[PDB]
């Protein structure tokens, strides 16, 4: 039998990947400089003057940025075969999509970009994730994200988990008043080391849906 990709997802074009990557780095530099962030350092880290977040997020994706749909590990991951055999997955393979980025976020584990999927794109979102959005009362695909960085001991799956936690809080209405205004939008302090920049203008990135084999 044919084995499957390591994972499926939307791979950003070089140009869109660079645009988003650079914006994410600028966000880390702006956030680390912000007085609201510096004030809350004890809830972010356990050791001490200034924390450079670019250094803190010391593992970054090495190639182009991507929005993962289904991790398959060549067939060895749960639900991989069922995902890959879907008509819509085969139909979409190699095809171009536009992804809407609505927010950048930081936690003590990850730095990411929130993706708001279209209905057509949601058809490619897996229905069997460990800790699916629906398990927390959120719409499927809510945790779609592009990972921009993570801390030394952190794994890729963490970014979507962190986003789900942030979105659950906003749902609770504990987003709070903005604590600052950055060039690209309002900054929110969600507690427990968690920060969100809500973009005034959503960032559209071009991507191709396909399979990565490593
Ligand atoms: Cl989900």
Author numbering: 162 to 209, 213 to 378
Text taken from the publication that reported this structure:
2′,3′-cyclic nucleotide 3′-phosphodiesterase (CNPase) comprises 4% of total myelin protein in the central nervous system (CNS), being the most abundant CNS non-compact myelin protein4. CNPase consists of an N-terminal polynucleotide kinase-like domain10, a catalytic phosphodiesterase domain11, and a membrane-anchored C-terminal tail, which contains a cysteine residue that undergoes isoprenylation. The catalytic domain enables the rapid hydrolysis of nucleoside 2′,3′-cyclic phosphates to nucleoside 2′-phosphates. The CNPase catalytic site, lying in a groove between two lobes, has pseudo two-fold symmetry and contains two apposing His-X-Thr-X (X denotes a hydrophobic residue) motifs, characteristic for 2H phosphoesterases 113537.
Mutation of active-site histidine residues (H230Q, H230S, H309Q, H309S, and H230Q/H309Q double mutant) abolishes CNPase activity. Overall, the structures of H230S, H309S, H230Q, H309Q, and H230Q/H309Q are highly similar.
